[PDB]
Amino acid sequence: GAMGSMERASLIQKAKLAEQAERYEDMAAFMKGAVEKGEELSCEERNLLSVAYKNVVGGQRAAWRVLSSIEQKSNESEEKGPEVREYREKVETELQGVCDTVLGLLDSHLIKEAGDAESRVFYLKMKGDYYRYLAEVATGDDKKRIIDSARSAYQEAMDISKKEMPPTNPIRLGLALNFSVFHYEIANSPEEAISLAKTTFDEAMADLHTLSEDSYKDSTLIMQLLRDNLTLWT
Amino acid sequence: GAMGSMERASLIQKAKLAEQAERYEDMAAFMKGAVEKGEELSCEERNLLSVAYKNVVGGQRAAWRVLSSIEQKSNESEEKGPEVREYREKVETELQGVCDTVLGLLDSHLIKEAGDAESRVFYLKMKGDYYRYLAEVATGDDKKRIIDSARSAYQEAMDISKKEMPPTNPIRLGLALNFSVFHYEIANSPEEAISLAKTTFDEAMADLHTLSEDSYKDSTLIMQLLRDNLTLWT
Amino acid sequence: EHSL
Amino acid sequence: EHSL
Ligand SMILES: [Cl-]
Ligand SMILES: [Cl-]
Ligand SMILES: [Mg+2]
Ligand SMILES: [Mg+2]
Ligand SMILES: [Mg+2]
Ligand SMILES: [Mg+2]
Ligand SMILES: [Mg+2]
Ligand SMILES: [Mg+2]
Ligand SMILES: [Mg+2]
Ligand SMILES: [Mg+2]
């Protein structure tokens, strides 16, 4: 790895600088280097890893959607040659490469060393998310296995979170939010998506009285996202 | 070059797709490949080249400014180690590399083959702009020569534009706008900047009566930018 | 998108 | 920035 000669603490410092500079490809490379030092990640470090790759893959997903839409229209039309498909394929392969990189970091060896609920649920949720991004661009016979991998990671995260975290825990809430999106957008299960979002929202509502002002703000922010999706879906 | 095996027309098509997808690094690589085919660029193609590299270097400049500001504050303070300087230097070197790439394309061989005023003034103006971006990050004894190179390119573009284009020509207006910014921000000549912006604005105003609705809109948009700078500077 |  |  190109970051093998840099100190772990320097990689973390530079990831934070890269975030401030909106240099998310750099930020992800720095955090990959930090993971590859072999030590577990703190809560703050896990969030830096997630922010970095979320921004990188988010740009790729947005670009892939633009190109896929142009490609689909081109097949409704004048033959413009292979270029739209070629370039959509190029972006798709790069996106798949980033997802494979993240999944590889989780498998070597973040998840296996994660024993606390907050770390294990965080990682997986991430594993579910990046298999979900792979599913968005997959087609038949590979899509089914990718979908099952996403489902399996989300389900293990859910099982741990329900046993080990309060229903207002922001990690638990964000996992439920994203698993519900998986059900709606990937798994063709809108009723499961709605049920999950509603039960998650209602059980968090009943636990808000236990929270400080700052925790209350953290939890209600994600509950609003659940509500926003329920509003769109029902 | 990695684009050497792709058709010129396919590179141009993919540059347009990359623009729609906001994939500006790809867009610049495609347009570099098109330039390296050795043929002159049409008006539309010149604009694709400029949009691509403007977006790439614009992100680098924004990041460099964030990091330079953090670095300057760190020297007012707790010693945080070499990391801020190292990372600012990394971004700076990458920025300089992009500017050198653009300048190399203009020198091999866009400017020498550009005989019409619209192409020659466009190219440079671009040469002035990318030496100006180099000047923004340069320090003494190199900064002076870089500043002179920017000035020389802008001055040749100005001389051609005043002889060969009407005062409302959008290329001429944008060149004057950017040369005035050069005077204000790089050359420590705010009075020259203000004089240039005012004379450019006034001479365009007096020529607006000759324009169609569409040309009128094109010219007044850039005149508003001149006015905006005069408002900030006076 | 509607995720976190 | 104040350029074109
Ligand atoms: Cl391609
Ligand atoms: Cl660095
Ligand atoms: Mg060490
Ligand atoms: Mg593919
Ligand atoms: Mg129903
Ligand atoms: Mg339920
Ligand atoms: Mg050919
Ligand atoms: Mg330097
Ligand atoms: Mg004065
Ligand atoms: Mg004057």
XYZ file of C-alpha atoms and ligand atoms in Angstrom:
486
model
C 0.000 0.000 0.000
C 1.090 3.540 -0.843
C 0.253 4.636 2.727
C 2.380 1.911 4.327
C 5.169 4.340 5.203
C 2.946 6.932 6.916
C 2.201 6.905 10.642
C -1.294 5.836 11.648
C -1.820 9.109 13.534
C -0.645 11.106 10.500
C -3.091 9.245 8.250
C -5.952 10.084 10.619
C -4.851 13.737 10.824
C -4.683 13.969 7.031
C -8.089 12.289 6.641
C -9.537 15.094 8.771
C -7.753 17.718 6.669
C -9.002 16.067 3.475
C -12.562 16.198 4.807
C -12.222 19.941 5.459
C -10.862 20.379 1.918
C -13.681 18.212 0.441
C -10.998 15.901 -0.981
C -12.879 12.686 -0.373
C -10.815 10.388 -2.619
C -7.762 11.431 -0.581
C -9.743 11.012 2.630
C -10.685 7.449 1.672
C -7.099 6.570 0.738
C -5.871 7.911 4.086
C -8.508 5.953 6.007
C -7.778 2.785 4.014
C -4.138 3.224 5.000
C -5.162 3.623 8.637
C -7.310 0.465 8.564
C -4.430 -1.459 7.024
C -2.252 -0.682 10.058
C -4.163 -3.566 11.624
C -5.464 -1.877 14.782
C -9.123 -1.472 15.635
C -10.817 1.857 14.852
C -12.232 4.211 17.450
C -15.745 5.624 17.092
C -14.439 8.848 15.491
C -12.190 6.869 13.143
C -15.049 4.613 12.036
C -17.050 7.699 11.170
C -14.138 9.107 9.135
C -13.922 5.852 7.179
C -17.664 5.924 6.493
C -17.801 9.604 5.491
C -14.878 9.180 3.096
C -16.217 6.199 1.176
C -19.833 7.416 1.305
C -18.823 10.562 -0.559
C -16.669 8.683 -3.075
C -19.290 6.049 -3.909
C -22.047 8.674 -3.746
C -20.494 10.571 -6.621
C -20.066 7.354 -8.589
C -23.690 6.328 -7.991
C -24.964 9.734 -9.091
C -22.878 9.555 -12.273
C -23.951 5.972 -12.981
C -27.608 6.997 -12.683
C -27.143 9.871 -15.148
C -25.424 7.580 -17.647
C -27.868 4.692 -17.178
C -30.770 7.064 -17.871
C -29.128 8.343 -21.063
C -28.430 4.748 -22.084
C -32.027 3.666 -21.472
C -33.396 6.560 -23.532
C -30.960 5.680 -26.335
C -32.719 2.280 -26.505
C -36.290 3.581 -26.864
C -34.140 6.440 -31.255
C -30.984 7.083 -33.273
C -28.120 4.610 -32.940
C -25.299 6.673 -31.422
C -22.745 3.847 -31.300
C -21.252 1.999 -28.328
C -19.994 5.055 -26.441
C -22.821 5.523 -23.907
C -22.698 1.856 -22.894
C -18.884 1.869 -22.797
C -18.729 4.894 -20.524
C -21.554 3.683 -18.255
C -19.614 0.402 -17.990
C -16.435 2.306 -17.105
C -18.131 4.177 -14.265
C -19.881 0.977 -13.145
C -16.601 -0.940 -12.956
C -14.997 1.868 -10.932
C -17.986 1.916 -8.574
C -17.789 -1.854 -8.147
C -14.084 -1.486 -7.410
C -14.721 0.972 -4.590
C -17.423 -1.264 -3.103
C -15.072 -4.256 -3.304
C -12.372 -2.215 -1.563
C -14.689 -1.298 1.314
C -15.997 -4.859 1.611
C -12.410 -6.097 1.643
C -11.484 -3.793 4.529
C -14.506 -5.002 6.487
C -13.495 -8.617 5.807
C -9.774 -8.017 6.560
C -10.247 -7.689 9.398
C -12.556 -5.038 10.839
C -15.662 -7.169 11.438
C -13.883 -10.170 12.905
C -12.117 -8.032 15.524
C -15.246 -5.995 16.361
C -16.660 -7.308 19.629
C -18.567 -4.347 21.019
C -22.083 -3.767 19.727
C -21.363 -0.205 18.561
C -18.447 -1.303 16.380
C -19.922 -4.592 15.122
C -23.309 -3.108 14.190
C -21.574 -0.175 12.461
C -19.401 -2.440 10.313
C -22.348 -5.126 9.419
C -24.422 -2.043 8.464
C -21.594 -0.832 6.220
C -21.326 -4.319 4.726
C -25.057 -4.248 3.977
C -24.786 -0.763 2.453
C -21.943 -1.585 0.077
C -23.534 -4.852 -1.071
C -26.668 -2.749 -1.612
C -24.689 -0.362 -3.833
C -23.404 -3.388 -5.759
C -27.009 -4.590 -6.090
C -28.100 -1.262 -7.612
C -25.945 -1.959 -10.697
C -26.168 -5.756 -10.793
C -28.283 -7.772 -13.193
C -29.733 -11.290 -12.948
C -28.053 -14.350 -11.377
C -25.381 -12.181 -9.826
C -27.963 -9.733 -8.499
C -29.694 -12.442 -6.455
C -26.534 -13.456 -4.597
C -25.517 -9.831 -4.000
C -28.992 -9.056 -2.642
C -28.785 -12.027 -0.259
C -25.366 -10.866 0.955
C -26.751 -7.399 1.712
C -29.776 -8.890 3.466
C -27.608 -11.225 5.560
C -25.324 -8.429 6.758
C -28.248 -6.138 7.618
C -30.053 -8.973 9.423
C -27.051 -9.800 11.619
C -26.660 -6.103 12.439
C -30.367 -5.860 13.298
C -30.234 -8.894 15.568
C -27.304 -7.464 17.546
C -28.760 -3.952 17.690
C -32.106 -5.131 19.077
C -30.376 -7.162 21.804
C -27.627 -4.697 22.741
C -28.770 -1.118 22.028
C -31.693 1.071 23.118
C -34.261 1.840 20.409
C -33.049 5.473 20.202
C -29.401 4.564 19.597
C -28.392 6.496 16.439
C -26.458 3.536 15.000
C -29.502 1.293 15.500
C -31.772 3.940 13.960
C -29.563 4.469 10.915
C -29.278 0.717 10.368
C -33.065 0.355 10.458
C -33.432 3.312 8.074
C -31.045 1.771 5.547
C -32.421 -1.783 5.865
C -35.876 -0.337 5.203
C -34.480 1.384 2.091
C -33.000 -1.987 1.070
C -36.452 -3.566 1.384
C -38.149 -0.811 -0.635
C -35.599 -0.162 -3.393
C -33.690 -3.458 -3.791
C -35.725 -6.376 -2.424
C -39.133 -5.443 -3.905
C -40.636 -5.555 -0.392
C -42.297 -2.157 0.183
C -44.567 -3.531 2.908
C -41.568 -4.811 4.900
C -39.889 -1.424 4.378
C -42.916 0.457 5.714
C -43.416 -1.919 8.665
C -39.772 -1.653 9.648
C -39.671 2.133 9.401
C -42.908 2.520 11.377
C -41.984 0.107 14.191
C -38.520 1.668 14.431
C -40.010 5.168 14.622
C -42.635 4.265 17.217
C -40.229 2.380 19.490
C -37.765 5.267 19.377
C -40.529 7.772 20.161
C -41.369 5.871 23.340
C -37.711 5.973 24.489
C -37.010 9.689 23.834
C -37.912 10.585 27.438
C -34.704 8.879 28.617
C -32.385 11.111 26.574
C -30.405 14.257 27.263
C -30.886 17.263 25.002
C -27.924 16.339 22.829
C -28.912 12.678 22.476
C -32.498 13.759 21.814
C -31.308 15.907 18.903
C -29.188 13.042 17.529
C -32.060 10.545 17.634
C -34.851 12.786 16.376
C -32.772 13.780 13.348
C -32.748 10.177 12.144
C -36.378 9.623 13.158
C -37.265 12.495 10.828
C -35.599 10.574 7.990
C -37.756 7.537 8.811
C -40.832 9.778 8.813
C -39.778 11.353 5.508
C -39.612 7.932 3.864
C -42.924 6.829 5.364
C -44.484 10.010 3.967
C -43.141 9.197 0.500
C -44.137 5.507 0.671
C -47.641 5.694 2.185
C -1.582 8.251 -24.009
C -4.321 6.023 -22.607
C -6.825 7.587 -25.043
C -4.660 6.895 -28.099
C -6.811 3.959 -29.192
C -10.154 5.798 -29.015
C -11.683 7.635 -31.970
C -11.602 11.422 -31.816
C -15.390 11.583 -32.239
C -15.861 9.025 -29.443
C -13.644 11.069 -27.115
C -15.738 14.174 -27.802
C -18.986 12.230 -27.278
C -17.700 10.841 -23.979
C -16.508 14.283 -22.838
C -20.097 15.488 -23.257
C -21.413 12.492 -21.314
C -18.849 13.096 -18.567
C -19.996 16.712 -18.301
C -23.609 15.575 -17.842
C -22.437 13.121 -15.160
C -20.296 15.828 -13.453
C -17.255 13.582 -13.974
C -14.834 16.367 -14.765
C -11.574 14.427 -14.327
C -12.876 11.990 -16.959
C -14.026 14.902 -19.108
C -10.546 16.444 -19.011
C -8.868 13.133 -19.864
C -11.213 12.680 -22.833
C -10.554 16.214 -24.082
C -6.792 15.805 -23.615
C -7.052 12.676 -25.748
C -8.974 14.622 -28.385
C -6.379 17.425 -28.463
C -3.617 14.857 -28.839
C -5.189 13.598 -32.079
C -3.446 16.615 -33.587
C -6.396 18.310 -35.302
C -7.621 21.793 -34.497
C -10.591 22.176 -32.131
C -13.946 23.620 -33.110
C -15.597 26.318 -30.999
C -17.723 23.747 -29.120
C -14.687 21.518 -28.566
C -12.614 24.400 -27.191
C -15.374 25.104 -24.709
C -15.448 21.437 -23.637
C -11.695 21.532 -23.029
C -12.031 24.706 -20.959
C -15.012 23.509 -18.898
C -13.276 20.224 -18.085
C -10.009 21.671 -16.819
C -11.686 24.668 -15.151
C -13.682 22.305 -12.953
C -10.685 20.085 -12.185
C -8.340 22.938 -11.258
C -11.188 24.775 -9.518
C -11.577 21.951 -7.039
C -7.823 21.839 -6.490
C -7.641 25.606 -5.919
C -10.497 25.487 -3.417
C -8.800 22.654 -1.520
C -5.417 24.398 -1.596
C -6.990 27.537 -0.118
C -8.583 25.561 2.730
C -5.281 23.855 3.524
C -3.184 27.020 3.173
C -5.492 28.794 5.635
C -5.181 25.961 8.164
C -1.411 26.000 7.668
C -1.180 29.762 8.198
C -3.212 29.574 11.413
C -0.973 26.733 12.628
C 1.935 29.218 12.409
C 0.378 31.999 14.509
C -0.212 27.898 18.370
C 0.439 24.225 19.096
C 2.973 22.400 16.931
C 0.910 19.735 15.155
C 3.802 18.225 13.184
C 4.544 18.293 9.453
C 1.210 16.890 8.271
C -0.604 20.118 7.313
C 2.358 21.327 5.252
C 2.856 17.883 3.692
C -0.758 17.610 2.593
C -0.942 21.217 1.345
C 2.220 20.436 -0.651
C 0.600 17.291 -2.066
C -2.450 19.198 -3.294
C -0.222 22.019 -4.577
C 1.920 19.619 -6.607
C -1.191 18.011 -8.119
C -2.579 21.447 -8.991
C 0.715 22.437 -10.604
C 0.626 19.191 -12.568
C -2.798 19.966 -14.009
C -1.728 23.501 -14.943
C 1.412 22.122 -16.605
C -0.734 19.641 -18.534
C -3.019 22.386 -19.849
C -0.081 24.649 -20.700
C 1.549 21.734 -22.502
C -1.535 21.150 -24.655
C -1.629 24.838 -25.556
C 2.071 24.704 -26.475
C 1.766 21.383 -28.388
C 0.298 22.600 -30.568
C -3.006 24.418 -30.103
C -1.744 28.017 -30.075
C 0.674 27.677 -32.967
C -2.036 26.290 -35.266
C -4.664 28.836 -34.148
C -4.940 31.495 -36.843
C -8.450 32.846 -36.394
C -8.980 35.488 -33.728
C -11.667 33.491 -31.895
C -9.403 30.465 -31.472
C -6.132 32.325 -30.824
C -7.607 34.711 -28.241
C -9.356 31.790 -26.507
C -6.149 29.772 -26.186
C -3.780 32.917 -25.096
C -6.514 33.661 -22.509
C -6.339 30.060 -21.284
C -2.546 30.314 -21.169
C -2.856 33.460 -19.048
C -5.397 31.783 -16.753
C -3.318 28.687 -16.048
C -0.127 30.679 -15.443
C -2.282 32.786 -13.107
C -3.309 29.641 -11.209
C 0.379 28.709 -10.971
C 1.084 32.220 -9.656
C -1.512 31.826 -6.882
C 0.629 29.103 -5.256
C 4.091 30.322 -6.259
C 6.555 32.061 -3.977
C 9.455 34.425 -4.715
C 11.871 34.224 -7.676
C 9.678 31.674 -9.390
C 6.564 33.760 -8.783
C 7.988 36.713 -10.723
C 8.643 34.690 -13.876
C 5.258 32.951 -13.669
C 3.526 36.320 -13.259
C 5.335 37.686 -16.327
C 4.298 34.630 -18.349
C 0.649 35.170 -17.398
C 0.891 38.875 -18.207
C 2.515 38.192 -21.588
C -0.167 35.713 -22.651
C -3.006 38.010 -21.554
C -1.385 40.992 -23.297
C -1.054 39.165 -26.624
C -4.682 38.045 -26.346
C -5.769 41.618 -25.577
C -3.868 43.034 -28.537
C -5.518 40.584 -30.951
C -8.980 40.987 -29.425
C -8.925 44.786 -29.695
C -7.886 44.613 -33.361
C -10.100 41.722 -34.480
C -13.246 41.557 -32.312
C -16.081 43.952 -31.447
C -16.098 45.240 -27.860
C -19.150 43.073 -27.028
C -17.564 39.815 -28.200
C -17.953 37.389 -25.253
C -14.421 35.999 -25.669
C -13.011 39.542 -25.614
C -15.148 40.403 -22.579
C -14.131 37.306 -20.629
C -10.462 37.910 -21.424
C -10.711 41.485 -20.143
C -12.530 40.269 -17.018
C -9.803 37.739 -16.226
C -6.889 40.068 -17.067
C -8.444 42.611 -14.704
C -8.603 39.904 -12.012
C -4.925 39.169 -12.741
C -4.105 42.844 -12.163
C -6.073 43.006 -8.899
C -5.227 39.654 -7.294
C -1.798 38.701 -8.708
C 0.036 41.779 -10.007
C -0.728 44.167 -7.109
C -2.206 46.652 -9.611
C -5.761 47.406 -8.415
C -5.893 50.693 -10.325
C -5.071 48.931 -13.613
C -7.710 46.308 -12.766
C -10.376 48.959 -12.170
C -9.431 50.980 -15.271
C -9.532 47.893 -17.457
C -12.868 46.682 -16.112
C -14.451 50.134 -16.451
C -13.214 50.826 -19.999
C -14.232 47.318 -21.069
C -17.706 47.770 -19.575
C -18.268 51.210 -21.088
C -17.089 50.241 -24.579
C -19.319 47.167 -24.545
C -22.301 49.237 -23.379
C -21.925 51.507 -26.400
C -21.939 48.504 -28.786
C -24.967 46.640 -27.341
C -27.311 48.329 -29.842
C -25.756 46.242 -32.640
C -26.661 42.885 -31.076
C -29.508 40.430 -31.470
C -31.437 39.341 -28.392
C -29.326 36.228 -27.940
C -25.998 38.026 -28.382
C -27.240 40.788 -26.081
C -27.895 38.214 -23.351
C -24.449 36.648 -23.867
C -22.628 39.983 -23.615
C -24.581 41.518 -20.747
C -24.012 38.416 -18.617
C -20.261 39.014 -18.695
C -20.672 42.784 -18.337
C -22.509 42.080 -15.083
C -19.419 40.216 -13.859
C -17.283 43.269 -14.673
C -19.765 45.453 -12.788
C -19.765 43.039 -9.841
C -15.988 43.322 -9.535
C -16.042 47.104 -9.893
C -18.620 47.216 -7.092
C -16.341 45.146 -4.854
C -13.191 47.122 -5.756
C -14.452 50.728 -5.653
C -31.734 8.926 -2.196
C -33.530 8.143 1.073
C -30.815 6.449 3.136
C -28.760 7.793 6.072
C -13.411 34.004 -7.025
C -14.224 36.864 -9.408
C -13.093 35.496 -12.777
C -15.161 34.163 -15.708
Cl -15.211 4.830 -21.703
Cl 0.263 14.061 2.231
Mg 3.977 3.918 13.884
Mg -20.848 -4.250 -15.889
Mg -49.972 -3.405 2.243
Mg -42.974 -4.350 12.328
Mg -9.968 7.843 -36.397
Mg 5.463 23.489 -3.435
Mg -6.526 55.373 -7.610
Mg -8.576 52.379 -19.374
